[PDB]
Amino acid sequence: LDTPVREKDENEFLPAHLELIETPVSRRPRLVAYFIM
Amino acid sequence: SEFLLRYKLVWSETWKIRKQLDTPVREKDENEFLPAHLELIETPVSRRPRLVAYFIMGFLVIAVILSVL
Amino acid sequence: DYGLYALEILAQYHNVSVNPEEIKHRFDTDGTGLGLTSWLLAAKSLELKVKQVKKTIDRLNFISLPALVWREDGRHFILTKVSKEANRYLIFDLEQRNPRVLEQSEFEALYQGHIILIASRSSLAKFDFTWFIPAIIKYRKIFIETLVVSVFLQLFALITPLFFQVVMDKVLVHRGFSTLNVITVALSVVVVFEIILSGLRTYIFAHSTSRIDVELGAKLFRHLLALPISYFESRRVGDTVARVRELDQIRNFLTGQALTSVLDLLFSFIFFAVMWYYSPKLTLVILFSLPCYAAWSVFISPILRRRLDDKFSRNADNQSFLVESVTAINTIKAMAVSPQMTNIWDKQLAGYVAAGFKVTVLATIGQQGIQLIQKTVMIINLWLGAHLVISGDLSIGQLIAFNMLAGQIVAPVIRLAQIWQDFQQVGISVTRLGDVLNSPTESYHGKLALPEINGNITFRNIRFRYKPDSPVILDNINLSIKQGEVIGIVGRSGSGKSTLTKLIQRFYIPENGQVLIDGHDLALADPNWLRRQVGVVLQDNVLLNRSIIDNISLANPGMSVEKVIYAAKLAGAHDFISELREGYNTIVGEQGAGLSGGQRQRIAIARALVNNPKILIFDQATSALDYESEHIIMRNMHKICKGRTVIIIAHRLSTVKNADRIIVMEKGKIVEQGKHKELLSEPESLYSYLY
Amino acid sequence: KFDFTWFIPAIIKYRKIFIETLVVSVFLQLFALITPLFFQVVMDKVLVHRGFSTLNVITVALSVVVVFEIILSGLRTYIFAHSTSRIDVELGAKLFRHLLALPISYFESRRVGDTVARVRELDQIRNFLTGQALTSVLDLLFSFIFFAVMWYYSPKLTLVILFSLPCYAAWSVFISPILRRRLDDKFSRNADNQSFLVESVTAINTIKAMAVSPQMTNIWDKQLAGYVAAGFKVTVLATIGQQGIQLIQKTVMIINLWLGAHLVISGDLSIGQLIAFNMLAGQIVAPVIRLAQIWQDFQQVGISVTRLGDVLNSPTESYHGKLALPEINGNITFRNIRFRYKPDSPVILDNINLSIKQGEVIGIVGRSGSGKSTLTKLIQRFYIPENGQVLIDGHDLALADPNWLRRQVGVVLQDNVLLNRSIIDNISLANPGMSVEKVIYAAKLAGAHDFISELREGYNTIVGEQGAGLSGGQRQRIAIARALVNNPKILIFDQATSALDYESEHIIMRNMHKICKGRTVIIIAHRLSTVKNADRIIVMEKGKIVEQGKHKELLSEPESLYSYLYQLQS
Amino acid sequence: SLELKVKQVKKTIDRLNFISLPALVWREDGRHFILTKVSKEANRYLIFDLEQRNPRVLEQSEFEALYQGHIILIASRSSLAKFDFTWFIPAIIKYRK
Amino acid sequence: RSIIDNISLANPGMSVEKVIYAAKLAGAHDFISELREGYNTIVGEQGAGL
């Protein structure tokens, strides 16, 4: 939480990678139903 | 800590400078003819909001006095 | 590069025309080949769907061919015409040779396990709110997930006051300790899960909207850099800076408490059903106040929009003024305009603060209106609930639960009222982004790409003016330039030779007549391609804040450093760089602050010549120089013009004395042509008069 | 020092209206105590026996006091915004005056977008101050009058709330530094983004002259990804803050519910008192959620004030005000001038020792990069020499007023940039009330009247950019006219004939006699033709005065560097 | 029309020390002049007479003899919609009282 | 379609130099080069537009 922003978070927000990934899935897609039940 | 002490020192130090940091009084038709900024800074709010707020004040005060006494 | 040749072969197989060097220009910015993501961007830009997927050795018999395989550690090849029951594969190697049939063992030795699949699907809207509609559709899974999370959040917030009604209706009346403990622990668990669920919801929504904003910013900058020069000429730099920072405004809005609040508001019918179940004649007041909320909102929205439009106009004017003052601080400080400059700053700042205050007073009036609508409904709810609990069909705990349900209904409404200012700010910000984006660009026809350029420049019947009402600058410029022809242009100050420089490269389009390069018309030619093939040293001569080596290699950063050494030696500035401490790595600073006039002049000369251009223009690349540095360029011209059509514009005639042709221009008319001695022989000529 | 205490006196300046807001603010809480109290009356005197007229009285007396709360809160925040915008205007005027009073070495070592972002942090302070921030903390500070009423209801639940508040404070102190650090990183990334955007749009002509769009696009994409990622980290920390505040609120609320129910079933408490307690708890925690929702804005304002301090604490060079030095002549004396642009940078001028007499049309010739512009920048108060001093009219320049000298000195620089104004105003930038005939005479003297008269708008056309919209020679002539439109005592023409053809140069040379009617002129030019008629030629190479004297006596020696340049010109 | 706010207001002899200068005074019965740079504790006023001459400092007695009691205050505020129903909206705002 | 495709209707992947040689051989390169779009202009109908 105190760590700064680095390459591992720099890469995933680069707009080209956004353009490739059509219908993108989030980092925590299964945590919703996991945290419900 | 020490920042509270220095804030109190500065507050008192500028507290002895009242009536020397204050600006002279001017009415509305006089103080709207100032450079655009000076006019923006030395215009009081108005005579209407102060009287409205004080009317609400007086209404509450007389209501409390009537309810208690 | 091979992968680019593979892309060209795939495009030819799918029957679409491509240029390998143009793809290298638009997708190999850092050089050292294309790469994977650059290849996929190029293929998508060619309207050619591609996907990098991992495939098993046996599944290659069901894919459609051709298919380029991407080898991480080495060279690539393209598989086509898969053969069954033969253990043989027909692969074209990108090494220039015949398509070879490779046997099973070597292929399984020379295959990493991934492949690229290729298919073609061949069956300009204004930037508005509607542009966000595909962004909603593209990120549909995330938004559906967020909707489900918000529905479950509303379910938790609905199950919260049932325990309250139970406690004030069945635990407070008779007795109870065990049921109280069960209610307490279940409520603690459910509120903990509610808090966690809400946090996850807003985190996921913020991430998705952050991705949307990044895509929007990339699109905005890409469209901005393709806009014409007259676009930037009519406006000011600060205006465009403010327009771009309006995207920062949109983002600062978007990843906050804005869309989660309206999502909670639109999912309030789950609450409404339960409140209607408790009592019929206590929800009609809320169901009537909601249209009252809508009426107040639609009454307050246009006035706030007009205030915020005025505020943004003031902000853009202040931004343009500030940027203009800072970027020219040398001349501002050199004279004593600073009192006047501060006076106009004070004028603009007071106007901006007045606009902001006039915005915020209306904002708080709108907030107090929403508060009044909430409070009147609250007091009439108290009145009717008191009647319904002193008469019957409603209990005290039911009244408490109803009151808190109404409060949880109206809390999203008050949050909307608090961020109404940011709502209207986005309403004007998207409009301004559209105003930037809807302007016509320097677009080129997406037809078959054009080959390399030989220096055949033909101006035919050219009539050009900068503005529609401006006086005619070029009257009847008709001129022909062949390859390897060192042309020089001379004339009076303001004759219009810089207009010829700006008309060679597609900075503007002529009003009448046309210019053709190698027989191809520019009216529809690609400006990016020609700007790649032409190296220009301009007259304004500004630099960019980076290292000297990077500044020189801005066009081609992927090349070596020995080419930079060669270019600096030809420009006569290699030594002046070498005796610096950092060498080529020194920071030149903003606007070429770290270097003087002649030094940055030689730097720009080297920067525009370090590439391999077919046309090489020097628009007064000498005027800022001096002697013993002029003569270096004069001696190096035999190496500079080796195969390149060189056009030199200079008021110093000694730089034009050795030109193949000398063109005198006056009021935008060409009066004299020929060699130096062919013009200086006649004493009545304008060349002799200028001599 | 502009750390945070600059607001301490000014707030004092409006102490009267502020005390007025306090007199309102506490009574607002009293109104916020009136509405819940009535509730318990309805739940203790109307619900027990009967009642229809007392409920009428309660409703009638409650509607008016609620409306009075609403209007009084509106007027309170109106007064606060109006009296805080004045502090905002004062801060803005001070900031811009100090910005224009800063030295050149401050500006050259950094970018433009950096200072633009620093000034826009004032706009951030503006959005903070006239918002929902200080009103919420003022309500929270004066909410303690509820606590006595809390002590009237129950001591245990009041102790629960009085222990809830330190939990809020301690956890806010725990979460503040990480959010501040991430917002500082986000601000630095935003400043870099603004710097890149300004340097890319200002130099759009050079960017589109070459074909280098994709490299700028890639750089922008990387910078945007970084900035938005840092902002997203700030956003998730703000999410953590809001969710933790919700957790504390809801847990304390559950404890209050359980303990209150136990007390009511145990006696000494009633249902009306309990629901009144719940209403007071909600209305006293509402400011806490209200401030927690804008904790990110609070940290952004902390960063903004720190950065405005970083700008304002830089040493200014506005004026000295020493004995009101009277008007100067062309008496310039250099003594042992040693100067470096940076402390680590190599020395440019080593042993410059020159003395210029009044009316002496002196020209300076040297190699490119020799340092001829350093003398131009050292005549004016752009820089301070490391060793030695210059003197004007016998007075040292280490203590002279920069604005006075730079209005007494007219200069055309090596690079000429104008403003987005008209020609009649661009030339007359020094004094806008000065008559048109003076500008006409200056333009005729500078040879700039012919093309301006041939222009479609005349003196009405607008320079669309720093120097765009016109030609290069026209821009140079306009700069020359702007320098000559006043009556300066020292003229400096650094490359005044660079973008001009030979005819305009000849016109300027013929008008040079009318230029120098009692003015000392220093001509920095590589072209030896424009300094042939100079009163004294000074040759410098590698920051050393190596030849000096008249033109003919220096050209008489074939071994001179001036003579060498002379046959290099031919 | 010059975008220059002006107002003809009556002003007392002592209130002239708080107005911003310059200020043209309108004499009903005769010629006008423009007061500027008011001097305190000196009973002297720097007025430019519209007769073509130098700006003169006038003493208190003659000024109070040559002043009707009114003045014009001047300030500058320097920070085409189609004719529709919206044009009546400022007309509503101007006549708000 | 375009002239470059109309001439090369038999094979769209065939190189441009073949079409250039065919047009020079047929005497059709001169007016096409003199055309504004070159090999990019569109035959607007069955044979109209030229």
Ligand SMILES: Nc1ncnc2c1ncn2[C@@H]1O[C@H](COP(=O)(O)OP(=O)(O)OP(=O)(O)O)[C@@H](O)[C@H]1O
């Ligand atoms: N950006 C522009 N916008 C509007 N008009 C322009 C612009 N640039 C040039 N002009 C007009 O076209 C004329 C030609 O100017 P141009 O820059 O071509 O001159 P030049 O001969 O190259 O000048 P010099 O050799 O002195 O640098 C100008 O005098 C001006 O009237």
Ligand SMILES: Nc1ncnc2c1ncn2[C@@H]1O[C@H](COP(=O)(O)OP(=O)(O)OP(=O)(O)O)[C@@H](O)[C@H]1O
């Ligand atoms: N802003 C700067 N920061 C650091 N070093 C600089 C800066 N400007 C110039 N220099 C260095 O100082 C030298 C002389 O600077 P100056 O601007 O006086 O040159 P000059 O003699 O006027 O140049 P030219 O004859 O090419 O116009 C340059 O060659 C360069 O090495």
Ligand SMILES: [Mg+2]
């Ligand atoms: Mg030019």
Ligand SMILES: [Mg+2]
């Ligand atoms: Mg120089």
